[PDB]
Amino acid sequence: MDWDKTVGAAEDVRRIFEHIPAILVGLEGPDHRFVAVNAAYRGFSPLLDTVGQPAREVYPELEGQQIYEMLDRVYQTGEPQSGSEWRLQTDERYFDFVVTPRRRADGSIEGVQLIVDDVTSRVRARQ
């Protein structure tokens, strides 16, 4: 595959990614280091300067919630996970997400990436 012709030029693709109207995040390695985050992501979690750092290292408080257990499973097994209405902590929100593995040409897993959707309105609509 010629990436420039079939996906797009790297700079252009990044500019589109940045602006996609959905929370997008890419992670690399066993320690889930941030490699790509967009504006909808950075607005969802404004406490940041994330690229290059392990997810645990920038969000130390999220150990108990085990978002990290689920990320490790995806990275170790290659099995994608979807979740609905996973709750979080303010500075009470609910999230749908799909996490998939990223494989190299050799079939090994280099990382995971996610799409996240904020569905708090649907849940808080529990009157």
Add this chain to the structure above:
Amino acid sequence: MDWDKTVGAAEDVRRIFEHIPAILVGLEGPDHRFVAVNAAYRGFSPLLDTVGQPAREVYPELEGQQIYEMLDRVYQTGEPQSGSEWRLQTDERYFDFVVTPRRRADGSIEGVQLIVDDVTSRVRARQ
């Protein structure tokens, strides 16, 4: 904003974009030229080699459906549009999508990008 530090390095971001588990597409200019498409996009529309070309020029049959009317409105006005269960043609499918404008530093619109979701199962479930 330092893009490498806040979004990610251009190559890395493109690799994550490619693998996002959602149909993603970026367009540029008035003629909606393809600048970025991912694997979920290219699987959704396999009749391709799209990057660099106007949407009308690669999909000449879609003039009547006026997906192009809606793309022009977003590009001209800056008003985002969302659609539900817009139908298409086989080689009978239904699509949710969100299209937004992309603004330059000067506030002018350079293009649009979309996220598309295939919701045919929900609709074909009209027994």
